[PDB]
Amino acid sequence: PQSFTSIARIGDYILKSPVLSKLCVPVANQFINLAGYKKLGLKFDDLIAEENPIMQTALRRLPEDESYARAYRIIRAHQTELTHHLLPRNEWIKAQEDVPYLLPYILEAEAAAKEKDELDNIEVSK
Amino acid sequence: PQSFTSIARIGDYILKSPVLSKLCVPVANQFINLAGYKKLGLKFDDLIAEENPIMQTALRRLPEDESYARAYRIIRAHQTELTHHLLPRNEWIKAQEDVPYLLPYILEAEAAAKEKDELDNIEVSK
Amino acid sequence: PGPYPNEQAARAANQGALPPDLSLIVKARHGGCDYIFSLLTGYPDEPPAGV
Amino acid sequence: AEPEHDERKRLGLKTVIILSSLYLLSIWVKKFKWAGIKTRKFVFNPPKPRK
Amino acid sequence: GPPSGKTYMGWWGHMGGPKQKGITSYAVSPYAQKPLQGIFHNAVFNSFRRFKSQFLYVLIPAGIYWYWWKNGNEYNEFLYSKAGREELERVNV
Amino acid sequence: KSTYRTPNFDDVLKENNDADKGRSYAYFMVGAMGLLSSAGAK
Amino acid sequence: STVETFISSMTATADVLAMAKVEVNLAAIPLGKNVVVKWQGKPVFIRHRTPHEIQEANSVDMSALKDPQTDADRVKDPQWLIMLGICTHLGCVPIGEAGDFGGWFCPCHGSHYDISGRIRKGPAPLNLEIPAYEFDGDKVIVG
């Protein structure tokens, strides 16, 4: 259970610096494509947990096409893992295919939750 | 469990037999008014069990006025018995006010269910 | 303790049965406290006539 | 047969005293918090004749 | 959670009893009452009335069976007393 | 009579105080009851 | 197989499967007294029957007994009464020297037995069991 906004802040701090980005972006890409989830054909915006209320508020606002594709990918992943195999080298997702689609909903919903939490317990403002 | 049609048959057998009915009707009404449910402000139909499905079917056809009066009588009986008391001779059901308002529905439902279950399991013998 | 080693010397000398353990005879019989008193008091020195 | 009669009777006296007190206490409290339910009255007004 | 079996009584809001209207209750707090307002009147008059009401169904079987037991006891006592050598032989045949 | 005409309850009503009189008595007795129950359990 | 193995583990073991043997001397038993000896989980009667009691034992009408059993079958020595202390009636040994028949008095019941131990009245349609024993001279081995 870790907030997404802190991760976004760290990413914004590290990417804009030229030397850090040019030294740590390719290593990040090779870590992420050696992770194993791209191998099975799953977009990265599906592996995270779906039990905290932030996720429930997030994908409740997700468009129909994204939800349908997510359901198809989830059931295909379940069947493939049950089958003890991998998909052929034609129906995977490339680097450009793994576009982040679940980010803005998380950002907005978690910002709303944070302002709720930090405004409910406000002080008298001495 | 005992069919009401048999009760009606025995009742009509008794009621039109002069000597036996003349012997058995005064003891009958004396037993009725020594039973004690008259004092508690109960009509007889409120006492017979209302659990098995045929009784529920009979209840569901009662006009709303009778059901409301029955509910009030049950509630008042519960309250009166909770205090082990008895209200004086003002709520007492009069001698001729204990008329069966629920017998015809019971008889009709008995006949219908009996002939239904008889003709359901039937043979084509001559 | 008791004079008998465990039980042997009892049945040999009683000229008959065994002596019941008195540790529980108070509740071993019906009646109770007065039962033993009556049993040890009411017996005459001579049996009833004809017995 | 029973080397606890004095202690048994003392403990029993204490127990019967405490249980008698508790029983009377429960009587009072049961008659107290059931007072609001043993006195409620019902009034039946027949409804207007329209289903 | 699948629904349970069909039963006449259930939970609050769905007793299953007939729908009723026109019933009015009138409660009042136990704090604004005397908790033992009528204990003596109850325990004397109502207790005696209930005892009188139940005094027509309980004592008769007890009395008849008491008579049966006592008659059996008298028969047993009389049999083994100055009759055991002439009467007890003609009953055990 | 309508619902507004409340039936009489004078038979069990008490002195018109309706204050800490009954409340303190009941609370003190239940406190004593807890005392005795705790002592017995201990 | 598992249930059978568990049951056989629960059932009687080796040491209980060994029967005990005891010898009782008949010289010291009084004529008018009853001696009861325990054998292998259950008691065994040892009574010195009087000569009059032998006649009563052997002169019992068969029609009054649900199970026909004579005196000579249940014991070899008419004078000595040696019977196991069991009561097929219920299982509790009748009280000695009591009863309407002059024999035994079953305590759980109040029913009266004869001097020969046969069943007279009750829900017992079966006579008491008969054990087996042998003589050895001045003593009898109940086993």
Add this chain to the structure above:
Amino acid sequence: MAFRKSNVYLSLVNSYIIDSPQPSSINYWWNMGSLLGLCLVIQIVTGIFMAMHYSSNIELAFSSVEHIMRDVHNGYILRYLHANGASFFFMVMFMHMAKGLYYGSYRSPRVTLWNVGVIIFILTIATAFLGYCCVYGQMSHWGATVITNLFSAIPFVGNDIVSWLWGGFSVSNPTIQRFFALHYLVPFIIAAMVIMHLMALHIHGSSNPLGITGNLDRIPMHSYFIFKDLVTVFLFMLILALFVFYSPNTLGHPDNYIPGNPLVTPASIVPEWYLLPFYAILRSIPDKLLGVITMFAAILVLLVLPFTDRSVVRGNTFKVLSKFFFFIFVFNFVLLGQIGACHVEVPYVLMGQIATFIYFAYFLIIVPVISTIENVLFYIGRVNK
């Protein structure tokens, strides 16, 4: 969904203890059943303490019982509580059955509950006998041998089954050890089946003394019935204290207090007070196997008791002949117990047989016919046209 009802662990207690819609016409007879359950669990816990401080070997069984009697602090109290708790347990079981039978609670809504209770009784009388066996006195093992000889009456086989059950032709360590173990174990089956009994009860609800529907009004059990249970158990505990402290060894019989010696039986041998009517029903019928099966029929007749009562009106409060005959029945039961207490001679056997006959005739005949007469009288008297 507050915290009390949202949390599953607290929700289970909420549906049972915190909130349960019992009717408002409950007499002082159902808290008697709750008292039955509570004295049962008290018996279980004191049994656990005993098993903690008890030895079952023949060389030490009587030694263990007298050591827990004498050579331990608060020891004799445990034995006295066991005896009085067993006696009160059977008394309250009889009261529970009488309340169930008189108020017509065996009818269609809770027939399953009725059979569950019946089988509870069938096996708890067994476990009571088994606990009676564990004493190993001059009459406990004596009655145990009695019951083994009784069970030996199975047709077509007489020796193999009795030898397997009784651990050979003799009695040794395995027999008494297994008997103690099974008296320890069966009450756990009692607890499980009582859990089933409460589940069925909660599913089907509770009946009323009025013998009418109770859905019209209901009240929560907590804060209304918990204190009624508290006061009735305080009364029960006061009575139990009176019988455990002032006169502890009165309900039991003065026969168990003899060291292990199955040589000479005591003059007075009688079963415990909660078994006399069944000893009478055995003694009346003049047959061994038929006597056993008629005892079992007397025990199991409650199973065939439903769908035999064709009285349209539930309960027995408003019917006079039925309750008169019910009182005749209960007094016949107590008379059967009393006659079984004494010995078997003329003329007790004749009236005992008559008592058993009227018992079985009652169950199998009289309630149907008198209930039919009650229903036809109900119909004829009201209708005068």
Add this chain to the structure above:
Amino acid sequence: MAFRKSNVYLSLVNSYIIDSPQPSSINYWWNMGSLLGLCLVIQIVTGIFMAMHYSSNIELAFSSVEHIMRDVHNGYILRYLHANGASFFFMVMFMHMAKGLYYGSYRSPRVTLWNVGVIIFILTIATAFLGYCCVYGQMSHWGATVITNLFSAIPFVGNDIVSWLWGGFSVSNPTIQRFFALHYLVPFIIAAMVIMHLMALHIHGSSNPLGITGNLDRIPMHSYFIFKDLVTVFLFMLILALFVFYSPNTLGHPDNYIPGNPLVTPASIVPEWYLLPFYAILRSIPDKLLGVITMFAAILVLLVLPFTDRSVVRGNTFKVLSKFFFFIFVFNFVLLGQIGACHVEVPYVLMGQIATFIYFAYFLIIVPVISTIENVLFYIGRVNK
């Protein structure tokens, strides 16, 4: 609605056993839990059958198992199955905990399950240690003394509780009687909390190896997962039978088959294999109460894991290096146990502190930094601006 779902007992059986929407990606690891439950049940059954012919006397305890071996039919089977089943229960329990840890089963919807499981773990630490103390062998008395004197360091109360445990001022008959009583009873508490565990799980459901929602495809428990449970339990029964019948002296230690006599004893005294991980850690920090408090810490670290890591992606299957550090930890656990098996000496004594430090450090400092690093690496990899 079918009658199978109508009857309350049958409805509960169907909804809790026959019908259960389990996930479709279940491996043998999840059937391992049901296998462990069956092992627990068979352990209780065989223990009950063992105690029926058992004597609780101090001098008749070792003699009791000797009599079981040499006199009763198939006596060796019960005790061998008991011991090997206990050892296998503990090994499969470690496997179950590890499977729960690696697959991220400790997330928010299962914190209650984690708590009840760790409570079962806490009690299971001693429920078999005291059972081993019961046998009174040649290190059993030593284990009993260790467990009874670990608590003596509490300030202002050091003698009263140990005196209560001792049943006096030393080790005597009360000690062994209490040991046997509690070793018998507290597995029933295990049964209670495992019923609670299964209730919570059935309320919330199982998890997936992938770490994503499993509410898409499900199959009923009966005829689909019953076969998997059946084959797993068949394999377990096969291996357990082969060990118990062919190699009895493999799981247990040949130290307890000697009567208790503190006169002559070898120096090869070491607790059973499953104690070693929580035994080597106790010998690192050199104080008396420090050992107890660090046992408390080592059993609470399993509890602090929820809301400690910062892995938004459930599980470790799809993380590049976190599984590597988990493997480092499991091998450190094994090596810590093995080095605790060896006696204290240089450098093993020096190895103790560093092993304990790594064992705690993975729990405390490794998981949050590694989770945050993994999350930021995912975020930088996925996006380009």
